[PDB]
Design an enzyme around this catalytic site. Structure first.
Site, PDB file in Angstrom:
ATOM      1  N   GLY I  59       0.825  -1.200   0.000  1.00 19.29           N
ATOM      2  CA  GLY I  59       0.000   0.000   0.000  1.00 19.29           C
ATOM      3  C   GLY I  59       0.853   1.242   0.000  1.00 19.29           C
ATOM      4  O   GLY I  59       1.756   1.385  -0.833  1.00 19.29           O
ATOM      5  N   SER I  88       4.945  -6.213  -2.232  1.00 21.19           N
ATOM      6  CA  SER I  88       5.289  -4.809  -2.254  1.00 21.19           C
ATOM      7  C   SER I  88       5.774  -4.397  -0.860  1.00 21.19           C
ATOM      8  O   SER I  88       6.717  -5.023  -0.361  1.00 21.19           O
ATOM      9  CB  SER I  88       4.110  -4.004  -2.828  1.00 21.19           C
ATOM     10  OG  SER I  88       3.715  -4.603  -4.058  1.00 21.19           O
ATOM     11  N   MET I  89       5.154  -3.395  -0.219  1.00 19.93           N
ATOM     12  CA  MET I  89       5.608  -2.994   1.118  1.00 19.93           C
ATOM     13  C   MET I  89       5.406  -4.113   2.144  1.00 19.93           C
ATOM     14  O   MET I  89       6.059  -4.114   3.177  1.00 19.93           O
ATOM     15  CB  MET I  89       4.936  -1.698   1.596  1.00 19.93           C
ATOM     16  CG  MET I  89       5.563  -0.419   1.052  1.00 19.93           C
ATOM     17  SD  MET I  89       7.129   0.081   1.823  1.00 19.93           S
ATOM     18  CE  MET I  89       6.930  -0.568   3.478  1.00 19.93           C
ATOM     19  N   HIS I 113       8.541  -5.682  -6.107  1.00 17.91           N
ATOM     20  CA  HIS I 113       8.511  -4.838  -7.284  1.00 17.91           C
ATOM     21  C   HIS I 113       9.055  -3.438  -7.002  1.00 17.91           C
ATOM     22  O   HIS I 113       9.554  -3.169  -5.911  1.00 17.91           O
ATOM     23  CB  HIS I 113       7.100  -4.836  -7.925  1.00 17.91           C
ATOM     24  CG  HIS I 113       6.037  -4.088  -7.171  1.00 17.91           C
ATOM     25  ND1 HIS I 113       6.284  -3.036  -6.311  1.00 17.91           N
ATOM     26  CD2 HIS I 113       4.689  -4.201  -7.235  1.00 17.91           C
ATOM     27  CE1 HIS I 113       5.138  -2.559  -5.856  1.00 17.91           C
ATOM     28  NE2 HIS I 113       4.157  -3.255  -6.396  1.00 17.91           N
ATOM     29  N   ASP I 162       6.873  -6.954 -11.435  1.00 17.65           N
ATOM     30  CA  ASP I 162       6.364  -7.838 -10.383  1.00 17.65           C
ATOM     31  C   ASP I 162       7.102  -9.166 -10.419  1.00 17.65           C
ATOM     32  O   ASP I 162       7.165  -9.804 -11.458  1.00 17.65           O
ATOM     33  CB  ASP I 162       4.880  -8.144 -10.573  1.00 17.65           C
ATOM     34  CG  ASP I 162       3.982  -6.964 -10.288  1.00 17.65           C
ATOM     35  OD1 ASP I 162       4.464  -5.843 -10.036  1.00 17.65           O
ATOM     36  OD2 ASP I 162       2.765  -7.183 -10.363  1.00 17.65           O
TER      37      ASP I 162
END
Lengths: 181, 192, 193, 190, 184, 189, 193, 191, 188, 193
Positions: I59, I88-89, I113, I162
Site C-alpha cells: 500500500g 510490495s511494502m 517490485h 512484479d
C-alpha cells in the site's frame, strides 16, 4: 448505418419486402403497420414478404400488426430469419395460409404472456384477469393458425418452448423450411 | 438525538436505554414501519413480558403507517396467543397494518390519544412474471385481503361486508370516529 | 461504573451521556426534524419522567423546523395526557409542528429565549393517484388543517378566524411577537431575572 | 475513535467528558442542530454542576445555521456562569458571533486564529408572495445579528453593517482591536 | 481495529504515557482530538514533556494552526516525531515542536509547500479570498522561518512548489533537530 | 430500423405518404409533442380538403389530459369527419379520442384492447393549494365522464361507475358499450 | 424537390414538415414549456410572417404550462409590436405565461377550444445568497408581479385589485369562465358555427 | 417543436426560419453566451458584412450572458465590421447580454417594453496554489475594470458610477435602461 | 463474522503473547495501529521478542516505512512471519524483520517490485514528483539489498517488474530465513 | 459482569457473544467469503485455541464459497502448523478454497453434514496491462493451480492426474460423493453416532 442504393430498406420496400427486426414495441409495430397499409394502397392483390427477427415485446402493439396482416387484401407471407419468440412467433404463425416460412437455423419460441402490476389488491385482480383473457386469446390464435387443439397450445406454452424450424413446421407454426432459392 | 440512558445504582452501576427502562414497566412500542425487524422485536418483547409475568397487562403503544402484512400478522397472532392482555394505545398514526394491530388489542383495552390518525385500507402488493404466476399471487393477495377484513370485522363487531365497503379506498378516521366504528374502545385525553 | 461520554454513538451504547445527565434533571430535548424517531423518543422520555414523579415539572426544550404532523401530534397529546406540567422552552427555532409543540406547553410555563425564531403555517402534504383518492387525501388534510388551527386558537387565546388568517402563509415571529400573540407566555434572557 | 481517561470506584470518561470536568466545552466544525444542541446541553449541565464557576468555550467553527447558533448564543447569556470563549483555529460567520458573545473581558483567541464576519446567507424558491415573506425575515435576522455584534464589540451599528457586507477576515490582534475578543493569548505563563 | 490492553484501547494506554498521535488528514475532527489530548496532558502534569507522533499529509490550515498554537500555549514541551509523512500542515506541526525536541525516523518523507485554496463567485469576493490566502501564506512562511532559522526569502523560494525532503535533509534545513535510528 | 422513404418527383417519409391518403397516427403516449403533431396534421388535412374524411389510427395508452383534450377538441372543430380506428391499444385518453371519432365511423381491429378509467394526477404543497388542485381534477373527471356519456350513449351514472377503476374491454365489448361503432376484420366487408 | 416529412428530427434538416406547411397558412404554435428556445422560435416566426405580409392575421395556437417570464414577455412584446393582428387560440392548456400570451392576442381575436384548461397565477422564483442579494431579487420579482398583473388587467378589462386577488393562488378556469373573465373573447366548438 | 422550413421556388430550395431571417440581415443571440453561440454570431456578422458592408444588421438579444471571452469577441466584431449593428432586447439582456446590447451602434440600441436588463460585475472561480489564485484574481479584476469601461463609454456614465451600480446585480426595466444610457429607444409598436 | 471475545477480543488476547498482525492494505490506519502496538509492547518489556504476522498486498510507502523504521528503532527484535501474502511494502516489512528471525508458512506468496506512483499537473511539478519517486525506489532497493544480502544491481533487475516467489524461493533469495510447516519440526 | 448477546455489532464491543461462548468449546467458524478479514480471524482463533490447549481437537465449521487464495492458504498452513488437530465440518457449502480447507482438516477428522454442497475447481484470476506482465501473472497462477491440485491429491489420496482432470471445470459433489472422493472422512447425520 444504412447504405444508399433510396436507403436499402426503402428500396426493398418497393419490392414489397417489410422487416420486423428487434423488439416489438409501439414504434416498431406502427412502422410495420404503415408499410403494410402503403403496400396495399400500391397494389392490393400482390403478396407482401414480411421478414421476422424478433424476441417479441408488447402484446398490444403486436396484435395491431397481427390484425393488420389479416385485414389488408394482400396475402402476407411470413419468413423467420433468426429468432421468432413470443409475439414474434405469433406474427410468424399468423402469416397467410401456406406462405409461412423459416430459414433452416432459426429459433422459434412460444410461451405465455408476461406482465405485472403493483397496487391495491382490487387493481391487481383487474389486471390479473386481463392478462388471463390475453393468454386465452393468444392461445386461441395459435390454435387457429397451427391446427392444434387449444389444450395442446395451453400445455405447450406454459413454459418457454424453443423449437427448431423443422419442429415448428411439424407443429403448424410454419408451412415450409426453405434452405435455397 | 439518540436514546438516552438511565443509571441504576446497584450494591456499582447498571445502564439502561429509555426503551429498556420502559420495558420494565411492561411498555412496548411499535414506531414507524412494520417489517421483519420491527415486528420481531415487538414479538420478542411480548414473549419476554409474558415470561416475566403471564397475568399482568402489556401496554403496546402504536405509531405506524403499517408495512409488511406477514411480519405484522405475526405480531397480531402473538398478541392473541400470549396470556397477558395486550392493551393498545395509538400515539400518532395507526394506518393499514398499524390499525389492524390497534384494533387487535385486548377487549375493552384499546385506546387512542385524541389527535391520532387511524386509517384502514385494503392490502397493497405487486408481482411481475408469467400470467400463471400473476394469477397465483393475485389469488393469494385476495385471500389476504379477505382474512384482514375478517380480523377487522371480528374486533370491531362490524359486518364483513361493511369492512369490505369501508376499506376499498383509504379511509381516514379521527380518534372519536375510530371508537364509534369499534377500532378502539376509548379516546383518552388525560390520565386524570 | 457506567462510563461517561458527551454523546452516545448508538441507542444501545452502554454509556451515560450529556442528554442522560439532563434527563435526570427532567430536561427533554426535541432537536431537529419531527419524525417518527424523534417524536417517539420524546414520548418515551415524557412517560418515563411521569413514572419517576407525576408531580414534578418537565422542561421540554424545543429547536425544530417541524416535520410529520402525525408524529408531532403524538407528542402534543402525550404532553397534555401525562400528569406533570410540561414547560416548553424555545432554544433556536420553533416552526410549524415545532411552534405547535411550543404553544402546547403548560399554561403560564411556555418560554422562549430572546433570539428564537417562531413560525406558524398551514399544513403541507402531497398525494399522487386517482382523482377519487386525491379527493380523500384532500378532505383529510383540510380536516387536519382545521384541527391544528383549533389547537393554536385554544392555546394562544386568538379567535379561530385570526389563526386561519395568520397561518395562510408562513408567518415568522420574533420571541416578543410570539409572546404578544399567545404562542408563549414569557421571553427570558437571564436566569437571575 | 475518541480516547478514554479513567479516574478514581473508577469511571471511564471519553477525553471530552474528562475535559468537561474542568468546565471545558468545544464547538468544533459546522454549526447545525446536532452540534449546537450538544453545546447547549453541556452548558446547561455545567450550570447545574455549579452556577458560579466560569465555563471555557473553545470555538473552531466556520459557522452554519443561524437558528441553531442563536440558541447557543442565547444559552450563553442566559446561564449564570460566565462563558469565557476561546478561538482555536477559525471563528467565521456564526462562529465569530458566538466568540464575540462570550463574557465581557473573557473572550480570547490563540494568535494564529482566523476570525471572519459577514452578513447572513439564505435561500428560498416559491411564489413571489412567499419570496417576500422570507426576504423580509432574513433582513430582520441580518439587523438583529448586526445589533448583537454592535453590542458586544462596542462598534456603532453603521460600522457593523459596513464591515459585514462582504466576508471580512481578521487576524487575532485585529479582532481584538475591533472588539470581537478581549485578549490574544500566546502562552499560559504570560 | 483497535486492540484492548485497568483495561484501555491501545491509544488510550499510550496517552497515559503522554504519547499523542496525529495520523492522516488534518481536519476539524483530527485537529480537535489532538488539542483535547494536549490540554488533558497539561492538566495531568504541566511540567512533563509530551510526545507528538506525526504521520500526516496535512489538510485544513485553520484546524492545523489551532494545534500549532496549542502546542506553543501549553506549559509542557511538545516533542514532535515524524513516523512516516509530514507534508504541508503536517510539516508545520513537526517544525513547531519544542526547541531541540523535533525528531524524525530515518525513512520519513517531509514536504513543505505554499497554501492551497480556492473560491468561486463575484470578482470582489474572489479578491477578498485571494488577499486572505496571501496573508495566510505570509504567516505560515514566517512560522517556518522562525522554527527553522532560515531567512523568510529562503522559505518563500523553497515553498513556491512542493519541496520534498528526506529526514537528514529536513534536519539540515531546520525542520527537525534529530534523526533517530534506534533507541539504544 | 428507421423511417422508410417513398418517392412519387418528391420524397415522402412513409407517414407523409400515408398523410396523402388522409391517414394520421397517434402512436404511443399522449403528451404535448405527440398531441401537437396530430393537431397539426388534422389542421393541415382540413386545409387540403374540408369535406373529405380523415382516418385517425390510434394505438395509445393515453397520457396528458390537457394535451389529449386539444386533440379531441380539434377533431370536433374541423369540418372533415374524423374516423377513428384502434390498432392495438386505446387506453385512458386513447379511448376517449377513439370514442370521440365521427358518429358511425369509429372502428377497431378485432384484437385491440380498449380501457377506460378516471383521471390520475398529483400535487404537493400547502393544504389550500391541495384543495385547489383537487377541485380542478374533480371538475376534469366530471367533464371527461360527460364526454364519454355523450359519445357512448351511456348515462353519466354508468360512465362514473364503469371508470372508477381500470376497465378493460375487447373490441366487440367496446362496440356494445358505445365506444366504437364497428369491429372490422377484413377490408372486404 | 424538397422532401416532405411529418416532423423534422433536426432544426437544419432539409425537409418540409407539417409545421412548415401550416406556417405557410400563417399558423404558429407554442407547444410545451416557454423557454429561450421555444420563445425565440415563436418570435422568429412572428417576424417572418410580418415580413411576408404586414396586413394579414397570424393564428397563434397555444398549448403551454408557461415557464420563463423573460422569454415569454419577449413573445408578448413581439405580438404587440408587429403590424399583423395576432389571433390566439388555446388548444389544450394555457397556464401561467401561457395564459398571459393567450390573453395578449389581438382584441376580439382571442379564442379557446371548449375543453381547454386556462390557469392564472403569480410569478414563481428563487434565489440563494447573501441577504443583500436576496433583497435585490425579491424587489425585482415583486415589480415583475405588478407588471404582469397590469398586463392582465389591461387585456381582460378587470381592475388591478381583481387581478391581484385572483392570481394570489393558482386559479384554474374552464374556457367559458375564461371568456367571462376577459382572458379570451370566444369559445369556439366548430368551424362551421 | 423545432425550427420550421420555408420552401423557395426556383426546382425548390429549403431554408430554416433563422436562415430565412438571416436574408433580412437579422441575427439572434438566444440563451447563454458560450464559444458555440458567440462564434455563430460572429460568423453571421462577418457573412452579412461580406454580402453588404453598408447595410445595417439587426441583432436581437435574449441572453443571460455567460462566458466573457466568448462574448467580448462578439462585442469586438460588432465594432470592427463596417455595418452598423443595431441591437434589440427581446426578453432578457443580463451580464454579457447587457454589454452586447449596450455596445450596439449609437442611436440604434432598442428594447421592447417588457424586457429585463441587468448589469453586474464578473463571476469567476479558481482553485490551486495561492500564487495561481493571485494570478487569476488579478486577471478578473482587470476584466472587471475593462467591462466597466465598456459600459461607461457606451452609456456616457462616469466609470465610478458604473462601478457603484454593478457591485451587486442591478435589474432595470427598459425605460430605466434607456435613462441610464444602455439603450437609446424603448419601442412598443412598429407603426 | 466479527472478532470474538474471551472473558479481550481475540487480537487483544494474542497481543498478550506479543503477537501483532498486519492484515490487508498498508495505509495510515493499519500502519499506525502496528506502530502503536510495537511501542506498547516495547514499553511493557524492551527485551522480549515481538512476533509480527504479515498478510498484506502493500500500500502506501510513507505509512509502511514508518512501520519499517519503528521495527528497527525499538529495542525488541521484531520477528516477522508471512501468513498469506507479502507483496510490495508487505515483502519489505517481512524482509526487514530481525536477522535470522524472518519466517514464512510454506504456501505463502511473496512478491517484490518497484514503487507505483501518480501525478497530474504542470511539467515542473511532474518533474518534482518524478525525482522523488526515483529516490524512494533507490532507497527501497537499498533496504532490500541490505536485508537480503543481494547486491543492489540484482535487486534492481529483479524488481523492475512484479516478481512472485514461493516461500522456499524467498528464503533462497534472503527475504526470509526459514520456511516453517510444523511447530514440532526442527527449524532448518 | 460482561453482558451476553447473540452477536457482536463491532470488533471491540465489550460483550460475550454466541461465537465467543462456542470458541470456549474450541468451535471456530469460517462463514462466507474467504478474504483477508475472515481468514485472519480464523488464524487468530486457531493460534488462541492452541495456546489454551495444544492437544484437544479444534472443530472448524466451514460454510464458504471460497475467495482469495493467499488469505485462504494462510488458514490451510496454520491448520498444518499448529499442534492440535483441526477437525473440519462442512455445514452448507464448501466451494473452491472452502473445499481445500475442508479437505485439509486432520486425517480421519474431516466431516460433512448430509445435505452440504462440496465443489472443487481450478483457480480464477485476472490481470490487465502489458503483455510481459500478463505472462508474469499467468505463469504465477499456473504455479498456484499446480500447488493447489497437489494439496488436494495429498489429502484425498487421488493421483495428481485425477485431481487435474476433475477440477478443470466446476465439480459439484454431494457429501457421500465427497467422502468417496476422499475430501472428507465421514458424513454425519446424528449426534448419536
Amino acid at each position: 448505418l444504412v447504405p444508399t442504393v433510396f436507403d436499402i430498406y426503402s428500396r426493398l420496400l418497393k419490392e414489397r419486402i417489410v422487416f420486423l427486426n428487434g423488439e416489438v414495441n409501439d414504434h416498431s409495430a406502427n412502422l410495420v403497420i404503415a408499410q403494410l397499409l402503403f403496400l396495399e394502397s400500391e397494389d392490393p392483390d400482390k403478396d407482401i414478404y414480411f421478414y421476422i427477427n424478433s424476441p417479441g415485446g408488447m402484446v398490444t402493439a403486436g396484435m395491431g400488426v397481427y390484425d393488420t396482416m389479416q385485414f389488408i387484401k394482400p396475402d402476407v407471407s411470413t419468413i423467420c430469419i433468426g429468432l421468432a419468440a413470443s409475439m414474434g412467433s405469433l406474427l410468424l404463425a399468423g402469416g397467410a395460409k401456406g406462405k409461412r416460412y423459416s430459414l433452416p437455423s432459426s429459433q422459434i419460441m412460444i410461451h405465455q404472456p408476461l406482465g405485472g402490476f403493483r397496487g391495491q389488491a382490487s387493481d391487481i385482480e383487474i389486471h390479473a384477469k386481463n392478462i388471463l383473457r390475453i393468454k386465452d386469446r393468444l392461445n386461441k390464435v395459435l390454435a387457429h393458425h397451427t391446427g392444434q387443439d387449444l389444450e395442446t397450445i395451453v400445455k405447450d406454452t406454459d413454459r418457454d418452448n424453443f423449437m427448431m424450424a423443422d419442429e415448428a413446421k411439424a407443429y403448424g407454426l410454419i408451412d415450409h423450411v426453405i434452405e435455397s432459392r
